[PDB]
Amino acid sequence: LVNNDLADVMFNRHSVRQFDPNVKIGRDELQKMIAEAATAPSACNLQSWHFVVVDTPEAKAKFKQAVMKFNYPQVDSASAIVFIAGDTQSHYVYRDVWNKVYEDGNITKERLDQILGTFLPLYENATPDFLKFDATIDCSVVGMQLLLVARAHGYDANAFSGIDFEKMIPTLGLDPKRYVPVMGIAIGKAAQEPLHTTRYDAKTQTDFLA
Amino acid sequence: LVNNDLADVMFNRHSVRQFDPNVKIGRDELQKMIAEAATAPSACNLQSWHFVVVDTPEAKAKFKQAVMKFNYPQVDSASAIVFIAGDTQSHYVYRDVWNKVYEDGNITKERLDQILGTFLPLYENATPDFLKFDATIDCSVVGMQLLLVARAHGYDANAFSGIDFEKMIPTLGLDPKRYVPVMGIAIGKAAQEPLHTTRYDAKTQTDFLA
Ligand SMILES: Cc1cc2nc3c(=O)[nH]c(=O)nc-3n(C[C@H](O)[C@H](O)[C@H](O)COP(=O)(O)O)c2cc1C
Ligand SMILES: Cc1cc2nc3c(=O)[nH]c(=O)nc-3n(C[C@H](O)[C@H](O)[C@H](O)COP(=O)(O)O)c2cc1C
Questions:
Q1: In terms of residue numbers, what domain contains A164?
Q2: Across the strands, what pairs with B187?
Q3: Which of A2, A5, A6 to mutate to test the interface with B (most CBs of B within 10 A)?
Q4: What keywords appear on the UniProt entry (chains A, B) (predicted)?
Q5: How far, in whole angstroms, is CA B104 from its chain's centroid?
Q6: Where are the beta strands (DSSP E) in chain B?
């Protein structure tokens, strides 16, 4: 790890929007940064995130057809963009995994039903909006970890959702009935000082119940 | 920070669900950890998160009325629970800050309207579902940072959404028309070894566009 200093990585994280157009990131490292991000938590461990990596001029051209122009600087200059979509059928993926173990004979049907019992009635019976809701949280927490991982690797990043929400999933070659678009994570070596920001005094946003 | 080892804080983070009942956390450190998490990014820097801290027995007993029974052990034993809710009127909050900036006479009127133009029409013009969407994302990324910040302070944590989504916001004494429940963050010193979990091979979840 280029930067294992947690305070520095987290408390000095800003949205960098201008990257060195000459720096590329190998696909080995990109997949690795994604895996590291994916140590993130998720409800019932469904890990309902999906990454589409945009790291070539050709990919960027297609991708930009669903991105609003004010986010083109990040997109044009970034070494890679990792777009994060939410899999609203992730509970079936999870189920399929366990079903296979059972079919192999390495768990009984009883064990399989016990496993499925812990998540499947909940998710199988959930509304589309709740599914969308849960997948969005998963996408966001892993997105947050990816922002941090990028800096841990010596890079910088910008999360963005300034996009065409109805166009993005088909633009990525994904199944629009299944995946919900959440955010893009542009990653690169910083070529320009990020815009400074402030935060509210957290006391204005905090209540003690008793 | 007690633990500034990023790899350790992030890659060894587990959901801890049973805490030492006798370890307490002072409200200054609780408020500090919240402030640290709140360095998190957010669309248009609206910071649409709201925190309700539950750190007394009285507060726990009321809070638990809106929590599902299988999450009782976490709430019962944690030093504190930070409940995170989404403020779907956060754009009016940011507006009010720039009005007071004018009300002090340190910006012109047209800068104020310029400043307002770059977020307030976008958010006023958005469906309640989209406001809910954006606020949830905000709650999730600050939630993720709080999980890490807790470990950076030498504690552990569990995020949970196993709640009564009708009762939570009124149980917290918040306006149900304004705030949306997203997740609770139980924080304390671990009293059990956490359940082991696995992750998918992240390559199964990753596409390269071109
Ligand atoms: C969900 C989300 C969406 C965002 N979308 C954009 C975007 O479309 N364009 C952009 O320039 N920045 C975007 N950002 C970055 C924010 O503007 C930035 O995080 C905020 O102003 C705080 O600044 P900082 O990240 O430098 O600390 C987004 C951030 C989040 C969390
Ligand atoms: C949005 C969200 C909601 C969660 N809700 C619960 C919950 O209600 N009860 C619980 O025990 N754990 C809950 N968790 C923790 C997950 O079960 C856990 O993160 C997942 O199984 C991976 O385990 P790990 O956190 O130890 O890596 C939740 C996690 C997330 C991200």
A1: 1-210
A2: B80, B157
A3: A6
A4: Flavoprotein, FMN, Nucleotide-binding, Oxidoreductase
A5: 32
A6: 49-54, 80-87, 156-160, 179-188, 206-208
